[PDB]
Curated annotation (Swiss-Prot), chain A:
Role this protein plays: Component of the ribosome, a large ribonucleoprotein complex responsible for the synthesis of proteins in the cell. The small ribosomal subunit (SSU) binds messenger RNAs (mRNAs) and translates the encoded message by selecting cognate aminoacyl-transfer RNA (tRNA) molecules. The large subunit (LSU) contains the ribosomal catalytic site termed the peptidyl transferase center (PTC), which catalyzes the formation of peptide bonds, thereby polymerizing the amino acids delivered by tRNAs into a polypeptide chain.
Residues with PTM Phosphothreonine: T102
Family indicated by similarity: Belongs to the universal ribosomal protein uL3 family.
Residues bearing PTM Phosphoserine: S23, S155, S296
Record-level Gene Ontology MF annotations: RNA binding; structural constituent of ribosome
Full protein name: Large ribosomal subunit protein uL3
Record note on modification: Methylation at His-242 by HPM1 is required for proper 60S subunit assembly and promotes translational elongation fidelity.
Species per Swiss-Prot/TrEMBL record: Saccharomyces cerevisiae (strain ATCC 204508 / S288c)
Lineage of the species this protein comes from: Eukaryota, Fungi, Dikarya, Ascomycota, Saccharomycotina
From Swiss-Prot, chain B:
Entry protein name: Large ribosomal subunit protein eL24A
Modified residues (Phosphoserine): S7
Tree of life domain: Eukaryota
Subcellular compartments: Cytoplasm
Subunit structure: Component of the large ribosomal subunit (LSU). Mature yeast ribosomes consist of a small (40S) and a large (60S) subunit. The 40S small subunit contains 1 molecule of ribosomal RNA (18S rRNA) and 33 different proteins (encoded by 57 genes). The large 60S subunit contains 3 rRNA molecules (25S, 5.8S and 5S rRNA) and 46 different proteins (encoded by 81 genes).
Family per record: Belongs to the eukaryotic ribosomal protein eL24 family.
Function: Component of the ribosome, a large ribonucleoprotein complex responsible for the synthesis of proteins in the cell. The small ribosomal subunit (SSU) binds messenger RNAs (mRNAs) and translates the encoded message by selecting cognate aminoacyl-transfer RNA (tRNA) molecules. The large subunit (LSU) contains the ribosomal catalytic site termed the peptidyl transferase center (PTC), which catalyzes the formation of peptide bonds, thereby polymerizing the amino acids delivered by tRNAs into a polypeptide chain.
Curated annotation (Swiss-Prot), chain C:
Entry protein name: Large ribosomal subunit protein uL14A
Function as written in the Swiss-Prot or TrEMBL entry: Component of the ribosome, a large ribonucleoprotein complex responsible for the synthesis of proteins in the cell. The small ribosomal subunit (SSU) binds messenger RNAs (mRNAs) and translates the encoded message by selecting cognate aminoacyl-transfer RNA (tRNA) molecules. The large subunit (LSU) contains the ribosomal catalytic site termed the peptidyl transferase center (PTC), which catalyzes the formation of peptide bonds, thereby polymerizing the amino acids delivered by tRNAs into a polypeptide chain.
Pfam families tied to this protein: Ribosomal_L14 (PF00238)
Residues with N-acetylserine modification: S1
RNA sequence: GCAGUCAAGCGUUCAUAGCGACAUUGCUUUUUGAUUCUUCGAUGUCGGCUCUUCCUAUCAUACCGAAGCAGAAUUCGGUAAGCGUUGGAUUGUUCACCCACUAAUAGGGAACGUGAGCUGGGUUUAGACCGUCGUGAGACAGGUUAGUUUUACCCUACUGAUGAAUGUUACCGCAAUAGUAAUUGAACUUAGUACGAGAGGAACAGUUCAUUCGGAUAAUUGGUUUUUGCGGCUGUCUGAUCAGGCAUUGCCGCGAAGCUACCAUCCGCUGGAUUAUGGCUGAACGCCUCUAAGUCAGAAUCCAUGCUAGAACGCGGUGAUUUC
RNA sequence: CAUCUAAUUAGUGACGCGCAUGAAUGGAUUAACGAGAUUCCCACUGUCCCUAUCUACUAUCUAGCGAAACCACAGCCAAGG
RNA sequence: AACUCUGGUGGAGGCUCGUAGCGGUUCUGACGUGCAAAUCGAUCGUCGAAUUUGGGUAUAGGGGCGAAAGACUAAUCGAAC
């Protein structure tokens, strides 16, 4: 007999299986549609999530009650050093899908990206690409032949980039290597752009602008084996119950004589690859810059880093993307920021955002001071000779 | 873009920090944090809490 | 919520489910209001209809004049005592839960509200703001 | 319980806008009768809670056709199960009834879904009281009160997790297939405009929010506190001091980090093909006709874009490939 | 019918041609008492809205020790019969 | 005037709160191939007498014994072994 009281289904059946992702670097499964008229540029860029902080800005939303009034907003900071270009990949449309036809690598790879090919770097002879680096010998004939192949065939051109992780306050030393599809026209011009940019670094201000919707592709924070109440949002059973209340009570009818795939069950929570769209870029900040945390309304010569570093991350010494709200993945984690797959004109996009203040108080407590000079001016002098 | 003052500790309140309490006689009490909020709700006098601005100017600490 | 409301409301944190008794702020002769419903509520299984500041609720009177007691009547929540965030970042709360008796068109049965009134309630109901004194 | 055919008649006139007598033909197994076919060397017996899926006989939402459709509100019907379909008083109830919100509070199935999931309120093994019946022991689909709810570690199924084999090993990918998700409302404006004699009173576009759901995230706020971090306090013990022990985390206040909350924030894509329906051209049938050939628009539908997993017997590109 | 509630097959107070009440098979009442049955109110609370977090002991993995129920043969479904 | 009132004293009661003790209300908690063929934890009733209990003794099966449940009579009771 029927349900007697209709309720919505707990959880989303399209975010299944709720399993651990294949790697920490969540793959971009869709790049923007290639406009062949625009200049050649990256469609994604790779960063490491530093942390969240707080901004204040005048909201420009006519008809809203907070039009021309200050809103206090959460932002996510992605520490974002320039990526080095180390290869190009050609992709041929086949009746079974895209097919990588050939990869061409740059002549010199740094030890960061060479570390990506080694599970035991300290033991190795470090022989990777030692015979590929002899393909650039005396005229680069075997490299220009493969690049001519990518120009002749290969309807899609992706570039191999790697993060500069030694510029990042991480203990990892091992770069993250990823393909980013080159949008911008003429397959020949894309291969020419990649070949000019071999061993060169692309910064984030050449990819992303302020007031731009971007997509965040990242593996979320891992939470181990989790039960069905916190994994799926199911109701806790009443207090009187025997053998447990953090459960799903009926996991199926008698017929079908099988537990269904749509019945909520316990298992892994978190560490799922997620794509989250439409996050507004509030600041493309520069690393060769004090007053990263200063606005035109603040003018306090402070960087984006809070007092005492970003908690559990470090301090930002590179370029960064300050983006609106929450992105998937925890701090220290590789995140791929991607240009929007559609042209959004919804008036929450297309809104010119000017920050008035950026919170650089300590996130290691309930921190009260924005700068150490502010701490000195409030607290006065101390017993340690302040 | 206004920095308020905590009604217990005299602490500078930046936007978002702490809470605001409207009493029955409609007096606004802004608190920088839950420490000040709980000490106010415990009916503690700020003049006897040894780290507050009111204490330090009542005892002429650092002037 | 429905009729009488002059504008929209940003989402205020719900602090007054059904069964909540709030004080009666106006001078209509009631002492408290017992919330039996919330106008504009959402239909979710097991979930209580819950009010917030500025919401028009259905209420009875448990303490007050006998001519107001034992009846269903509209009320408007004017004080919440549950912490809610404004879009200027301020998490604020009142000391007590309070509402005023109104008719379904939003005009207020009493004549004077004793105490502060939330700004969202005053901006949503102009008859509450007209009889209100201090707003927040 | 729900349909259909005929049409005397009701409907100011007018059979068929909406109904429709006398007849008559059916559907479904969601009630109840009928059987005794399976089960008597245990198929756990109602209701509720929980949770999933399915049906359409569509309550709402989307798009439409008809009216005794002026507007508003309704009424009849089509595609349509994509998406929702409530909070309570009483009662063990299913059912009922009322209060109230809502876009709406549609009907059903899944061993009258679901007891090694729960609960045990109902029926009730032994206790007991009453009423009636009986001389009595006792009876009552009469009332009342109390009454042990056992086991999974096996196989499968599901949920997550490894993993031999492919020359080895590493990196970067393709995407067959499977899943898929967003939902609804209000205020402003249109506009007191269209329509109407008035009374009344819309819609599209625009904008701001909100409901339900989902996926994250923890800057802020709240919660948690074995940070036994810092302070305080009781009782006792270490001769007092200092510093501590014990009080099964002794208690109180604050408490970073971590986890977390519609109790907090952020985010939740747009193309094509269609159904109903309205059409174009146009015969059949020299006229007419959306249809027969051909064709246009078009639903919350469908399939893609997007999203999730990646076939551990699907594939590709690339790096290095062991002797002194 | 009244009262209690927004709403009460509950509670209480009444009415009584009472299927089938009733006088030691005791009738009516009754202070105090009751781990009895029931209803309402105040206080209180994670009972709930709506769930979150912490602790210890498990579970888990290991060294050792090491059972039992059950068992025709076994173990992927859909439909048919 | 019969006689009233007040403050002490005294220490009664099958009186009360509550240890030991004796029971066993609720969780319908734990366990439920148990520590246990009835236990464990919290919560409870009672706690100076119709109390609780050891030893001795008596009553024996269609018999006993029963402040009465067909209860108990050696894990056996609507008739033990
Ligand atoms: Mg239903
Ligand atoms: Mg569903
Ligand atoms: Mg793709
Ligand atoms: Mg963990
Ligand atoms: Mg946990
Ligand atoms: Mg599981
Ligand atoms: Mg974030
Ligand atoms: Mg922090
Ligand atoms: Mg419920
Ligand atoms: Mg048999
Ligand atoms: Mg059985
Ligand atoms: Mg069975
Ligand atoms: Mg149909
Ligand atoms: Mg219809
Ligand atoms: Mg279907
Ligand atoms: Mg479905
Ligand atoms: Mg059943
Ligand atoms: Mg079962
Ligand atoms: Mg059972
Ligand atoms: Mg019972
Ligand atoms: Mg095991
Ligand atoms: Mg869709
Ligand atoms: Mg969540
Ligand atoms: Mg002890
Ligand atoms: Mg201690
Ligand atoms: Mg949510
Ligand atoms: Mg024609
Ligand atoms: Mg057609
Ligand atoms: Mg045709
Ligand atoms: Mg078409
Ligand atoms: Mg598209
Ligand atoms: Mg594979
Ligand atoms: Mg009741
Ligand atoms: Mg009576
Ligand atoms: Mg007694
Ligand atoms: Mg252990
Ligand atoms: Mg162990
Ligand atoms: Mg066999
Ligand atoms: Mg089968
Ligand atoms: Mg006694
Ligand atoms: Mg006693
Ligand atoms: Mg005792
Ligand atoms: Mg003894
Ligand atoms: Mg038990
Ligand atoms: Mg067990
Ligand atoms: Mg044993
Ligand atoms: Mg005898
Ligand atoms: Mg008997
Ligand atoms: Mg015996």
């Amino acid at each position: 007999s029927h349900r007697k009281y209709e309720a919505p289904r707990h959880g989303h059946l399209g975010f299944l299986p709720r399993k651990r992702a294949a790697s920490i670097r969540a793959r971009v499964k869709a790049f923007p549609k290639d406009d062949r008229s625009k200049p050649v540029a990256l469609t994604s860029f790779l960063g490491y999530k530093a942390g969240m902080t707080t901004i204040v800005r005048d909201l420009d939303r006519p008809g809203s009650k907070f039009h021309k009034r200050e809103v206090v907003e959460a932002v996510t900071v992605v520490d974002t050093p320039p990526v080095v270009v180390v290869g190009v990949v050609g992709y041929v449309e086949t009746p079974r899908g895209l097919r990588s036809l050939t990869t061409v690598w740059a002549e010199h790879l740094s030890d960061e990206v060479k570390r990506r090919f080694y599970k035991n770097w300290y033991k190795s002879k470090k022989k990777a690409f030692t015979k590929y680096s002899a393909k650039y010998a005396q005229d680069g004939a075997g490299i220009e032949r493969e690049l001519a192949r990518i120009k002749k065939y290969a309807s899609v051109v992706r570039v191999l980039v790697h993060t500069q992780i030694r510029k990042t306050p991480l203990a990892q030393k091992k770069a993250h290597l990823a393909e980013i599809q080159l949008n911008g026209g003429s397959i020949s011009e894309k291969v020419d752009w990649a070949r000019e940019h071999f061993e060169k670094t692309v910064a984030v201000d050449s990819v992303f602008e302020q007031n731009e919707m971007i997509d965040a592709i990242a593996v979320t924070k891992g939470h181990g084996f989790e039960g069905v109440t916190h994994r799926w949002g199911t109701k806790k059973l009443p207090r009187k119950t025997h053998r447990g209340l953090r459960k799903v009570a009926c996991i199926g009818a008698w017929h079908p004589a099988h537990v269904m795939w749509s019945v909520a069950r316990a298992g892994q929570r978190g560490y799922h690859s997620r794509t989250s769209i439409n996050h507004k870029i509030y600041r493309v900040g520069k690393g060769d810059d004090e007053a990263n945390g200063a606005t035109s309304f603040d003018r306090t010569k402070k960087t984006i880093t809070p007092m005492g570093g970003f908690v559990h991350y470090g301090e930002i010494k590179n370029d960064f993307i300050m983006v609106k709200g929450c992105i998937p993945g925890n701090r220290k984690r590789i995140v791929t920021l991607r240009k929007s797959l559609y042209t959004n004109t919804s008036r929450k996009a297309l809104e010119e955002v000017s920050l008035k203040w950026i919170d650089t108080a300590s996130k290691f407590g309930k921190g009260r001071f924005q700068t150490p000079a502010e701490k000195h001016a409030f607290m006065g002098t101390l017993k340690k000779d302040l | 873009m206004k920095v308020e003052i905590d009604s217990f500790s005299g602490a500078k309140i930046y936007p978002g920090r702490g809470t605001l309490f409207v009493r029955g006689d409609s007096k606004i009490f802004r608190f920088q944090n839950s420490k000040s909020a709980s000490l106010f709700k415990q009916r503690k006098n700020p003049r006897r809490i040894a780290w507050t601005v009111l204490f330090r100017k009542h005892h002429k600490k650092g002037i | 919520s429905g009729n009488g409301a002059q504008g929209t409301k940003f989402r205020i944190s719900l602090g007054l489910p059904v069964g909540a008794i709030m004080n009666c702020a106006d001078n209509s002769g009631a002492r408290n209001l017992y919330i039996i419903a919330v106008k504009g509520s959402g239909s979710r299984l097991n979930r209580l209809p819950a009010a917030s500041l500025g919401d028009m609720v259905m209420a009875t009177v448990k303490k007050g004049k006998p001519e107001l007691r034992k009846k269903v009547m509209p009320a408007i929540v004017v004080r919440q005592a549950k912490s809610w965030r404004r879009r200027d970042g301020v998490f604020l709360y009142f000391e007590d839960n309070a509402g005023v008796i109104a008719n379904p068109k939003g005009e207020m049965k009493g004549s004077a509200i004793t105490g502060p009134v939330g700004k969202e309630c005053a901006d949503l109901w102009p008859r509450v703001a007209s009889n209100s004194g201090v707003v927040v």
